């Protein structure tokens, strides 16, 4: 019989009336293109740019009655991408591309196969740099929702409808791990149908819920902001009434508390609102600034001066050091309980 | 009847006399191309480079009498971008491109449709990195005006005229939020007609007013420059005449005031003029440098030495500490009122 | 006789029935493509992105019975890359490309030669930026395993099978040195056959074992974290009961221990788990934080006050300075033995 | 009559003997191409790379007698860039390109028009990243001279000559402002004719004089290097013979003078010679290092010890503090006059 | 007579038997291609990536007897790069490309001219980013040897041989200066013939010797590491037996010695071996760490306590300050002689 590439030329080229510029079922019902993606790679989720890079296999299935052969004995004719400009393909695009490219190493990484009844599978490999608005109200404990939406660009709703297939519309690779996030298994699949002044265009989208790994910030952000507060509590014991060294422990633990406060937001977007790591680095700034402010209460009370008025100020310069030495591990411990319960509920 | 893509070939190709190199209404009135854009994405507004990235849908409408079919029953013939080099298109360009590319993922993201009377809609998707000169005289409280202008490159004013359409010439996407700025709703639409030695070329432009979010700099730039000034006011209470610790609080709050002064302009352009954050970080440098300069007045007066001359210098080393402890929260509070009223008016 | 380029046109083009879109041995056994690579350049192994760049010569050998000439006198007909779109080529791709390009300087860097029996050698030059997941549990002493896998994209397992040749399937250049790593000579070669819902696709992969050079981190990370611990041991000798200078050596060696702790992870991914350099910079932070905490035990015990109770606290303020001066070089030396034996075993 | 695009095809294509591979006036006098540029954008003048980005309109005018129509009624026939590979064009290149691209958004941004006598205007839009060697001997007060030169690549001097036109050979845009530099109005226009072993090739070049804005470095580099010198002069007043606090003001104002000295050259090329900002940060390092070296002369003389020898060293420990308190504002003020006069003359 | 472009079409195209896929002197001696380069630009020699960027004119001369016209009156026929795919060209490539591109601004920057006897000159413009392994054993005083090598890709040694011409095989531009290095005039030209399992391929290479400019590191690395050692020698004079200020000068000059030690390798590759700047920043770390360790010997000996035993320890607390004040400018001056003589010999 015929070879497939010679048989598929006479099914399409110039003699069968197949025109690649005209959609299937023309002047009839719209073409129902069904889609599913396979995420090979994921990540490099930046926050200065608020974008993330993904590497997908975009599979598109539709029906084309002009490609429905009947007499050839096989069940699926492939088509290499040299002759891929000879069929109709849906004009899918991503509504938040922000730059994207194909992969064309050793061959155009494109797949096409045509069944007997006309079902056309079309799988391409794309690298996307998708845009998602980061919501950083509770920054080390947030759950980001970064989406990707697949629209049509030229055909309206009465000509081309996108659908997610019911048999697992988003597959993820086997050992896909992210360095900072984890990809949750439940992925929302909903519609995003756009209305312009040109017309109404089809749109489908998949949500990805990206929960952070808190274990990094619990090593660099929280514990070196915890030990500086303990280091400011050393000043309550040194020389117990007055020294030129309690000031040096009161000055210096505000410096590296302030430097770490600016260092906690070194590679973050300049958001207007206050976030979760800001109400930690400003309350633990308050517990290390009140320690030097506590000595200024001591060295002003104890530097006041008959026979009765001698010990009456030392009795006010030891009660200020046996209460402010125990009440600060009560106020800081009741803040540390109210903080983490709030961000466990939210 | 005929399919549209076969009908549209005989409307243009080689038999109807349609030449795609010749503008409509030739040797007559100029072509009135009307334009409107749709900002999908906005942002990454850099200031080291003084540019911003935008992602638009550029729609262009004109009239072409050679494309006015009459006998075909429909109202709008589309045209896929494989045959888009066969019509006339206006040679629009952006006068401040600084690099711009199309989007060509899964299909050339281009749209064309031709009405019965000859009206041609032409929507393409462009990513621009536009240039706008930043005016940073009042830096955290400024209202930037970044423009984009759409010129003709080859046709003069007597051959091709650009207009903004009256029905919403600039649309913005629904949930378009910027991390640092806000986009005001009033967008100016004015002309920018260029005159060269080649001729006079048409130009239209849209201004975008970008107001900053002050809430970021009010957390990192102002409050850690506010607490260092309060930290320098602790030195008026410590030991009340003389210490080796008031110097240590006088030195160190100039260090991290100077380090934060260089740290306030880490990612900014090297502008010649003085800005709003510079007359905050240099006046709050003055209140923390005059505190150590105040102790140098104390430790020089109080280190002077009959029976009457003993208490006469302590009476000059306490009046210098009961006035300079209250006058500095008067001068700093009258500066802080004159500062913010100035930048609320401007 | 004929020149080779004219003889090779009639072997393939339009008269011999050779169709370049159809694989060899069609409707028969699968094509057995055998592969080997030649790593020219290697390196720029980043960890923020977790990727590495390689520069290979990808050689592919297969059999094509339609190219088996018999009457031409030579043994190997070459073919320049201008006519390289005329044979069948396997659609190999790398399953973790993350961007890759050819090299096209002065000529397409591509090779093709055809033997008499039909063996086809096909060598191209590719630059890859391959992805490998970094496992940083024991960070300066880890052995990374970064792989590269070579799948088919269009042909399933019953049409195209990849193999590594038995005669040295991965060659490395003569003087290939890495700045941070060393490439071990044993390279694993195993199968990675993928199963999708499209079909099952062939895959071969080569593991590369990249052992680090520990000598860099033993100069910047370990020795300047070793001398700060010795510098905190200077405070046990200074003035031997009480000073305002032991606090100044107790504060300051916690500052540059914490600053170096944040400086130890300046260009690393934000992993959740704790690594080998973190249980050094948090234990040597403990020995420099316990030194200031030791003086707080001294200056609180020695500041307590009949005739018998005078020397009883100095006898408790010297035993605390002749034991804590020797026990800290016992606890730090027994940690330093348990640390390096653990990472020598693992 | 004829449309212009059909008339211009028979003037060139295959019937008039016009060959686009052959220069005008062949085997005769050389082609006199005259050039002028229009700088749209300028800037991003880097110094680590020593290059600057420009965005020009390159206009080229020459004469081509084969394109001299006589009977067509118009005076100027345009030509869209689709048929622009059909005329002869000069093979101009930039001898210091370092990468350059065209602009191809919505149309190839290219212009061509042909007069009646044969004069051909050819305007294109290029983005260049031109290389200029920076001379940083006097760094914040220098006048850079960054050039751009336009050579021929294939035709020698006896076949093609470039000239600048006399009517404004370099135009600059209306509101072109640079953030760091200013572009002087006088632009030198001179020749740069190259001699290779291939031949001698034409070359023209324009010099651009880029004077800096000193006002930025006078806020960050000079004033925080001025106040540290005044801060070191506070140590002459504190306790007036001896303290543990004059050392703390002698140590610390060397630290942030050395840190600012390394911070003054954070983003500069690693030049070998000494520059103007180096002999400010090394002389003001000397005035803050000699202040601590002055106290080491005080605390060594005043710590020497009959009844006559008591006040003879205090008379040497007050003369050292009433001269070194006035002579240092004399030496620093006579340096500050000799410094700025030197860089005002040069 | 004929124009040259029409004469050169009948010399090659389809009638003269010229096939552009077949090398000259086929089934005979190999083609002797002779090469020389012209370095326009050089530099951006990075060391994190260990690569350098060069911008060359690659000239190639071979002989092609099929292009040997005899009857045309000229001596050299040029050929514009539109018809440059019609001759045979050698498939040269660079064996350490790491990315390279042509220059195609206003015309393909390519040159071709054919002499009467068949000699073909072929000059193109290439930008290369070449790889060279940096050897940093003696880092500020090293002489790098970065090479570039020119291989054949498709033709073996018995078909194509590269040579350097004897008339100046590497030219350098007139005013080519590097910011950090200097390019030595003696350039080695040697062979690098490769042996693969495909065959043996020709290769020629040019060594470039890049001697550094030590004058930058002698301002930032060595002098601020010299004054800190002098600053640690101030502590021998302050208060001469005991103070809380000698410790503060002993602590702080270890801090900024350690910070500058990490700051000396901010933008360097993470090499395993020790380099020349590391045995300066670790010996000058030793002279500033032994100064604080010297006071710990003083304040432990002088704090020991009949009538005879009073002055016997002051006699041991002044001999330790009149020897350790002169021996440290003897050990540091004998190190500073042994250091620079070692790196002057090597
Ligand atoms: C692509 O999918 C759409 C959506 O499922 C299909 O449109 C649907 O087609 C069916 C049968 O043609 C329509 O059912 C009909 O409903 C009318 C009342 O409107 C009634 O006379 C019958 O019950 C009849 O079954 C259905 O309304 C229609 N839905 C929409 C939203 O248009 C379309 O046929 C699919 N096209 C292809 C090529 O598969
Ligand atoms: C594109 O838009 C321009 C601007 O509206 C149109 O030009 C205008 O055309 C009208 C009618 O052709 C001109 O009005 C005429 O004015 C003359 C006096 O100059 C008088 O005899 C009549 O009152 C007549 O209506 C109008 O002057 C002219 N304006 C300009 C600035 O040229 C043009 O016709 C439009 N072209 C197309 C193809 O739509
Ligand atoms: C490509 O490689 C595969 C794998 O080596 C080859 O397939 C193998 O082909 C041989 C002979 O055609 C098969 O042996 C046969 O086994 C059957 C029992 O199944 C028995 O009747 C005989 O012993 C006979 O030798 C072998 O089973 C088969 N293996 C597989 C996994 O398919 C294939 O022939 C190679 N193709 C080319 C073009 O070199
Ligand atoms: C392009 O520009 C060059 C330079 O202006 C033109 O070359 C010049 O052409 C004129 C007239 O052809 C030459 O003048 C002649 O000088 C000879 C003595 O050499 C004498 O017999 C006459 O006085 C005559 O006028 C002039 O020497 C020559 N200059 C050079 C440097 O070649 C050229 O003609 C221009 N070409 C075109 C196509 O415009
Ligand atoms: C390209 O360059 C190579 C190397 O210079 C040339 O090969 C050399 O060709 C000469 C003459 O054809 C050979 O000399 C011959 O030597 C044999 C002994 O082997 C003897 O019968 C004669 O003395 C005769 O002169 C020489 O051996 C040969 N060298 C090599 C290494 O092959 C080649 O001819 C050049 N090709 C062109 C087209 O210029």
mmCIF file of N, CA, C and O in Angstrom, chain B residues 8 63 83 98 252 263 273 294 340:
data_model
loop_
_atom_site.group_PDB
_atom_site.id
_atom_site.type_symbol
_atom_site.label_atom_id
_atom_site.label_comp_id
_atom_site.label_asym_id
_atom_site.label_seq_id
_atom_site.Cartn_x
_atom_site.Cartn_y
_atom_site.Cartn_z
ATOM 1 N N UNK B 8 -10.926 35.114 -0.086
ATOM 2 C CA UNK B 8 -10.058 36.223 0.265
ATOM 3 C C UNK B 8 -8.742 36.183 -0.498
ATOM 4 O O UNK B 8 -8.031 37.190 -0.528
ATOM 5 N N UNK B 63 -9.537 52.172 7.127
ATOM 6 C CA UNK B 63 -10.454 51.838 6.053
ATOM 7 C C UNK B 63 -9.656 51.564 4.790
ATOM 8 O O UNK B 63 -8.738 52.313 4.451
ATOM 9 N N UNK B 83 -1.180 34.485 6.189
ATOM 10 C CA UNK B 83 -1.404 35.315 5.014
ATOM 11 C C UNK B 83 -1.463 36.798 5.351
ATOM 12 O O UNK B 83 -2.108 37.564 4.629
ATOM 13 N N UNK B 98 13.264 50.931 23.109
ATOM 14 C CA UNK B 98 14.367 50.363 23.900
ATOM 15 C C UNK B 98 14.273 48.833 23.948
ATOM 16 O O UNK B 98 14.379 48.197 24.997
ATOM 17 N N UNK B 252 28.235 55.893 68.214
ATOM 18 C CA UNK B 252 27.674 54.742 67.520
ATOM 19 C C UNK B 252 26.387 55.096 66.785
ATOM 20 O O UNK B 252 26.100 54.529 65.725
ATOM 21 N N UNK B 263 22.924 53.528 52.826
ATOM 22 C CA UNK B 263 21.993 52.454 52.551
ATOM 23 C C UNK B 263 20.633 52.894 52.068
ATOM 24 O O UNK B 263 19.860 52.060 51.591
ATOM 25 N N UNK B 273 20.822 66.393 41.770
ATOM 26 C CA UNK B 273 20.062 67.203 42.704
ATOM 27 C C UNK B 273 19.810 66.448 44.008
ATOM 28 O O UNK B 273 19.990 65.233 44.106
ATOM 29 N N UNK B 294 27.014 67.941 71.890
ATOM 30 C CA UNK B 294 26.513 68.519 73.133
ATOM 31 C C UNK B 294 27.296 68.030 74.345
ATOM 32 O O UNK B 294 27.543 68.816 75.265
ATOM 33 N N UNK B 340 6.626 67.429 56.394
ATOM 34 C CA UNK B 340 5.515 66.717 55.775
ATOM 35 C C UNK B 340 4.462 67.641 55.189
ATOM 36 O O UNK B 340 3.723 67.216 54.301
#
